[PDB]
Design a protein around this ligand. Structure first.
Ligand SMILES: *[C@@H]1O[C@H](CO)[C@@H](O)[C@H](O)[C@H]1NC(C)=O
Lengths: 48, 49, 48
């Protein structure tokens, strides 16, 4: 069996290429800018 | 009501207890600092983002 | 715990047997689109 008539068709596909690039300031996250939090934070060094 | 909360539970809206004037709270200002340099071989002048 | 997969073993068998029978009676046409009836030595002649 050999094809005689035919068709064409467009299909779509979708795939991401990037991401929502973020950033987290530590002071306004782990502290909330209390003076107490920044001074126990030195006991963890430059972990942030 | 006396105080509003945001979509996360931090108080961003204060009604004044004295004048019943309702006010938003913004953060103070925070962000990041970046530095622009052409290279220490090239100059000694910087731009700051 | 462990959960059994959806696509079971006999399904995993029966999708695999149709990869063989259709390759054995339609060959290139089995994957190229609508599978087409054809002798197997003709399929080899197509491949070779
Ligand atoms: C870069 O520095 C070297 C010495 O460290 C100097 O010889 C050279 O002239 C400098 N480049 C330019 C463009 O001045």
């Amino acid at each position: 069996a050999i094809p005689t008539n035919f068709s064409i068709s467009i299909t779509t596909e979708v795939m991401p290429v990037s991401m929502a690039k973020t950033s987290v300031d530590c002071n306004m996250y782990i502290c909330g800018d209390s003076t107490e939090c920044a001074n126990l934070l030195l006991q963890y060094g430059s972990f942030c | 009501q006396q105080f509003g909360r945001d979509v996360s539970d931090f108080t961003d809206s204060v009604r004044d207890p004295k004048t019943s004037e309702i006010l938003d709270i913004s953060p103070c200002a925070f962000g990041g600092v970046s530095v622009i340099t052409p290279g220490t071989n090239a100059s000694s002048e910087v731009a700051v983002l | 715990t462990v959960l059994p997969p959806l696509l079971t073993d006999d399904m995993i068998a029966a999708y695999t047997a149709a990869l063989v029978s259709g390759t054995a009676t339609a060959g290139w046409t089995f994957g190229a689109g609508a599978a087409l009836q054809i002798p197997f030595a003709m399929q080899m002649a197509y491949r070779f």
